[model samples]
Target chain A: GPGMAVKHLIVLKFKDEITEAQKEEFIKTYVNLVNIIPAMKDVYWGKDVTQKNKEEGYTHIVEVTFESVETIQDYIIHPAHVGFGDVYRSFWEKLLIFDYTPRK
Target chain B: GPGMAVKHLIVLKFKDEITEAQKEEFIKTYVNLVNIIPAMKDVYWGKDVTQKNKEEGYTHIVEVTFESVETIQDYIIHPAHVGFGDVYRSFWEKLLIFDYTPRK
Candidate 1:
């Protein structure tokens, strides 16, 4: 089995006026947060790219991998995550997150 | 990197009339379908366990892994997945599938 076993999915709806420059900065900072938060194994994020059955406004992400719930706890509470929020929180309007323990 | 690299997420809401027995049957049959579909790496499935800010009705799943987009195309077009539909299609009221190529 792979070490980065637990996959975490994050969805965020940013405010309408969030600039493309801000979006790029947020993406860079998301990686920065992952680098500083050791509990996180990896992060895979992108805007929703589907056209078939689009859900309105819910776009952008922070999909990541953690070792376990304990690892999630560490990442969720890490000051770096908090710091990232402190700097970029206002850009988002609504955030949704779901973490999965693969059922294989 | 791990062998099962691509993660595919599935969300489904069964019709209200679907019995508990039908639900269990559907879960078992999903694995059976996976067993037969060689491109599918694994499946992770469950109900939405959270209460806060919940999106109603869209529940149950088959979050899976495929080798790549070509592999997913293979599974989507494969006879087994189509066979799975022959048995369980009536159970789902709404289905949502999202595939991620993680940003990291």
Candidate 2:
């Protein structure tokens, strides 16, 4: 019952000096990585639009869903994930990971 | 360079049978566990107010920040964490954990 579905939220903070081109590349690579994961049921990526006063360091939020906790774990250590990390390592300044097992 | 600071957001949903007294006890145990971890920089716990529109399952949010990733890891595996888990297991229906490293 506990292992039915898992959701992962990844927030990425880009370096201030990163250009639009770099951001595009990062997204492209990240998307490709997620697409290859068989365990990923759904993936949503978006820019933060809540900032009304000033620009925040966190630029994007990524939500990924999996069929089970085992799938979630598999995606984390999957080799294909390395490509996304390589791109992120070059441009991202900070990263956040959050996960939860759905009750219903 | 990437291990400066980490922020953790934990969302907890309590069972319908949980009483105010139990919630207080849970908070006390959780706080005590965090206090024992030296890596914790800041901790904020509060009830969710965003459910003004309709009744939701999630009831509370806990935010914890640490100096580095290592410290966050330490707190996750710490034995004291087991105490809070035991209390939560008795009353909580769902739990969500999110962590991110800060760029600045």
Candidate 3:
């Protein structure tokens, strides 16, 4: 059967002036949310590695799954999520988030 | 147990001059890869939905899940993927791919 997981996809591009150290801190905290926020079912992420059509600025991707859309709502207001959200602007120059159901 | 799925994440930006017709075809063919190639487990995708930090140029996202890395390698070689790949340049100006194992 096809999985019923609702995936949360996040892509980020750091500012020209943001430090490498700042980038790591943002990701490490974001990835840690599965533990801090109960709704985050699973998580996977990494820097871009495409040999073709490299989207230079949007280099990092973070994918997280949740049980339902309601859970996703909880995640948005989650203290841990807000904690990370509070500092997002310090590192990221651009961000894109797409949340959707699986179709296979 | 945590999902041991290997997720293949693809993000794309269409060229300034590429027509809307070209964008739709690229996506239509790419999303159909799972049905054509047996190794693909599941797929999900959409354009940027986030209200914050909008990544203007990079708007679309595609995520496909596979049982294993070996299965992913097979997907890369699968003819359907190649079909989509061959025409990718007509529409996409930039792209980013990130493949990884999930963590809970």
Which residue pairs overlap in candidate 3's backbone? none
Error of 3 at B55 (Å): 7.5
CA shift at B89, candidate 3, in angstroms?
Answer: 6.4
Top candidate by DockQ: 1
Q: Where does model 3 exceed 4 Å of error? A: A1-3, A51-56, B1-7, B12-60, B64-104
DockQ of 1: 0.35
Model 2: what is its DockQ? 0.03
Supply every candidate's count of residue pairs whose N, Cα or C atoms clash at under 3 angstroms: 2, 1, 0
**Residue B67's C-alpha lDDT in candidate 2?**
70
lDDT tens per residue, model 2, A5-43: 556656577888999997887777776665688877777
TM-score of the B chain in each candidate versus the native B chain: 0.85, 0.80, 0.82
Cα-based lDDT at residue B54, candidate 2 = 37
Order candidates by TM-score, high to low.
Answer: 1, 3, 2
Highest lDDT scorer = 3
TM-score, B chain, candidate 3?
0.82
> Which model is ahead, 1 or 2, in terms of lDDT?
1
Error of 3 at B5 (Å): 9.7
A60, model 2: CA deviation in Å?
Answer: 0.9
Residue lDDT tens for model 1, B32-82: 877788898777675543322366445565677777767877888789888
Decreasing DockQ order of the candidates: 1, 3, 2
